[PDB]
C-alpha cells in the first residue's frame, strides 16, 4: 500500500521530464528548421540564378 | 536590343525584387516564429515549398 | 484524480501536478501567443485532465471565476492553473460513476430491449437537457453503431463498456504524472 512516498508516486517526473525533453528538442528541431530554411533558401537563390 | 534586352532587364530587375521580398519574409518566418508548434511549422514550410 | 485523505506533503505535490497538467494542457492548446487559449477549449482541456462539467456549469462556474474584470477574449494560465486546481482538490465536476450511465440508458429504453432507436436516441439528444449538433449526433450514432451506416438500433451495454474502457485508458493517460513534483530547495 506503499504508493506515494518512495515506491510509487514519481510518475510527475516521468512526463514532466518527457514534456521538458519534447520542449528542448522543439527548440533544437526549430533552429534546425531554421538552418533548413537557410539551406533551402541558399539552394533556391542558386538552381533560380542557375536557370 | 530596343525591347528583346530591354524586357529582359526589366524582368531582370522585377524577379531580383521578387527575391528580395522573399527573402525579407524568410527572415520574418525565423524572426516571428516564437510559433513553435512544429506540426502547423511543417505544414506552413510544406506549403512554402 | 485528487486524493483529499493523504499527508500535507501529499496534498501539496498533488497540488502541483494539477498545475503542471494544467501547464501542459494549456501550452498544447496555445495557438500563437505563449501563455494565451480560448474559452472554448477551456472545456476540451478539462475533459483532456478527466473533468465532465456541463456546458451550464462550465458557462457558470468555470469562466467568470477564470475570467477577468475587464472581458479578455482569452484565458491565460493564471486563472487556468488554480481554478481547476481547487476543482480537483474538491472534484468540483466529476462525472458520475458508470452505473449512473446503464441507468440512464435503461431509463431511455422504457421496454427494456437492450437497444435504442437511432432515431429516439438522437430526438433525445437534440430535444432534450444539452442539445447536440448534427454532427455531433452523427459522430454518435457513428460510434455507439460501431461506425455501422446502416445500423438502425444501438446496443448500449456494450457502448457502455466500450466508453468506460476509454475513460480508463485515458485516466491511466493522463494520471500518468499526477505523483512525483517536489518542493525544489
Given at each position: 500500500?506503499?504508493?506515494?512516498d518512495e515506491?510509487?508516486v514519481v510518475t510527475?517526473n516521468?512526463k514532466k521530464?518527457i514534456?521538458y525533453?519534447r520542449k528542448?528538442?522543439?527548440?533544437?528541431?526549430?533552429?534546425?528548421l531554421?538552418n533548413e530554411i537557410?539551406?533551402?533558401?541558399q539552394?533556391?537563390?542558386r538552381?533560380l540564378?542557375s536557370k | 536590343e530596343?525591347r528583346?534586352?530591354e524586357?529582359?532587364?526589366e524582368?531582370?530587375?522585377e524577379?531580383?525584387?521578387s527575391?528580395?521580398k522573399?527573402?525579407?519574409?524568410?527572415?520574418?518566418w525565423?524572426?516571428?516564429?516564437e510559433?513553435?508548434?512544429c506540426?502547423?511549422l511543417n505544414?506552413?514550410?510544406?506549403?512554402?515549398? | 484524480?485528487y486524493d483529499?485523505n493523504?499527508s500535507?506533503?501529499?496534498?501539496?505535490?498533488?497540488?502541483?501536478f494539477l498545475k503542471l497538467?494544467?501547464?501542459?494542457?494549456?501550452n498544447?492548446?496555445?495557438?500563437?501567443?505563449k501563455?494565451?487559449?480560448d474559452?472554448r477549449?477551456i472545456?476540451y482541456?478539462?475533459?483532456?485532465?478527466?473533468?465532465?462539467?456541463?456546458?451550464?456549469?462550465?458557462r457558470?462556474?468555470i469562466?467568470?471565476?477564470?475570467?477577468?474584470?475587464?472581458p479578455?477574449?482569452?484565458i491565460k494560465?493564471?486563472?487556468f492553473?488554480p481554478?481547476?486546481?481547487?476543482?480537483?482538490?474538491?472534484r468540483?465536476?466529476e462525472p458520475?460513476?458508470?452505473?449512473?450511465?446503464l441507468?440512464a440508458?435503461?431509463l431511455l429504453?422504457?421496454e427494456?430491449?437492450g437497444?435504442?432507436?437511432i432515431?429516439?436516441?438522437?430526438?433525445?439528444?437534440?430535444?432534450?437537457g444539452?442539445?447536440?449538433?448534427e454532427?455531433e449526433?452523427k459522430?454518435?450514432?457513428?460510434?455507439?453503431?460501431?461506425?455501422?451506416?446502416?445500423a438502425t438500433?444501438?446496443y448500449?451495454?456494450?457502448y457502455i463498456?466500450?466508453?468506460?474502457?476509454?475513460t480508463d485508458?485515458?485516466?491511466?493517460?493522463?494520471?500518468?504524472g499526477?505523483?512525483?513534483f517536489?518542493?525544489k530547495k
Open positions: 500500500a506503499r504508493i506515494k515506491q510509487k510527475f516521468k521530464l514534456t525533453w528542448i528538442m522543439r527548440i533544437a528541431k526549430t533552429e534546425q531554421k537557410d539551406i533551402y533558401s539552394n533556391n537563390q538552381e540564378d | 530596343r528583346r534586352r524586357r529582359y532587364a524582368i531582370q530587375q524577379a531580383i525584387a527575391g528580395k522573399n527573402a525579407a519574409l524568410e527572415m520574418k525565423a524572426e516571428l516564429k510559433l513553435d508548434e506540426e502547423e505544414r506552413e514550410m510544406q506549403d512554402q515549398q | 484524480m483529499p493523504t500535507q506533503t501529499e496534498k501539496q505535490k498533488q497540488e502541483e497538467k494544467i501547464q501542459e494542457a494549456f498544447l492548446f496555445v495557438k500563437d501567443k501563455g494565451i487559449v474559452k477549449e472545456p482541456i478539462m475533459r483532456y485532465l478527466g473533468q465532465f462539467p456541463s456546458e451550464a456549469q462550465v457558470d462556474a469562466l467568470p471565476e477564470i475570467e477577468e474584470d475587464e479578455s477574449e482569452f494560465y493564471s486563472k492553473e481554478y481547476m486546481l481547487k476543482v480537483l482538490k474538491e468540483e465536476y458520475d460513476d458508470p452505473e449512473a450511465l441507468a440508458f435503461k429504453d422504457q427494456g430491449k437497444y435504442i432507436e432515431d429516439m436516441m438522437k430526438t433525445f439528444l437534440e430535444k432534450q444539452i442539445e447536440f449538433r454532427q449526433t459522430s454518435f450514432i457513428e460510434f455507439a453503431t460501431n461506425k455501422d451506416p446502416n438500433v444501438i448500449y451495454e456494450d463498456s466500450r466508453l468506460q474502457a476509454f485508458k485515458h485516466i491511466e493517460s493522463v494520471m500518468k499526477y505523483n512525483n517536489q518542493v
